């Protein structure tokens, strides 16, 4: 699109390699640090899309 179609997405992080033909729809925040995080985006955990 001239203005830029941004409705196509792709997952960036996942804790494990998915098995053949798997799909996933969960959009829960992906944590990187050992200390668990929750709520919204911030440090050591982000949006996986």
């Amino acid at each position: 699109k001239v203005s830029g179609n941004y409705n196509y997405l792709y997952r960036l992080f996942r804790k494990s390699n998915l098995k053949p033909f798997e799909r996933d729809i969960s959009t829960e925040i992906y944590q990187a640090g050992n200390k668990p995080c929750n709520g919204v985006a911030g440090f050591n955990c982000y949006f996986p899309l």
Partner: antibody
Amino acid sequence: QMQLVQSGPEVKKPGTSVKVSCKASGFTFTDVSSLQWVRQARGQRLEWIGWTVVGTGNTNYAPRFQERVTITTDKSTSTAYMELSSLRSEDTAVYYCAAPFCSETSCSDGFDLWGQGTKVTVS
Amino acid sequence: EIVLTQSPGTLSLSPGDRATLSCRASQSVRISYLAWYQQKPGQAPRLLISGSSSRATGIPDRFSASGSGTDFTLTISRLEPEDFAVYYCQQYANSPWTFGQGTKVEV
């Protein structure tokens, strides 16, 4: 070794812009790894400027620095670019870029790596 | 929007003694997003304790973190003559992060 190198001190003139960069020694920007920038003046407290995410592309900026500084990252070259416009005498200080030992999509909350810093002075 | 106050302002203790420092926050309470730093003159600051509950790489057992509430505390068991530096508390959990002012220890 896990170490970060940065350019040397520079002197510039008013009415000009400065591009600042710092590189690593075998460290990869990847996606999970994120680097922040700090500045230290002569006998002054440390101030936070901004940190960016190489993978998602999200950036954070200070409200004071929301109009004349830009931070970008390039994973392929694993470099960080700061464009600073209208550098005054108050902007003459030492810059440091810090990132954690962030590999294999896992890393703690502490930034161990610490660059030497660039002494930027504009007269 | 978070201001940290580091106390005491200055120190002068015999080497090898036990010292403790504290720092003050005014925003919401968080204990795992605080870090302690030392900056030597002519060198970049170095991290000592991250998250107030874990040590960094190569950090000796000299530095011990404490505190549960809004206060944040650190303790040094022995003041070996190279430990003289400045201390900074830094928070992570809030809207744009901000350091402290700095606690200086003297001989």
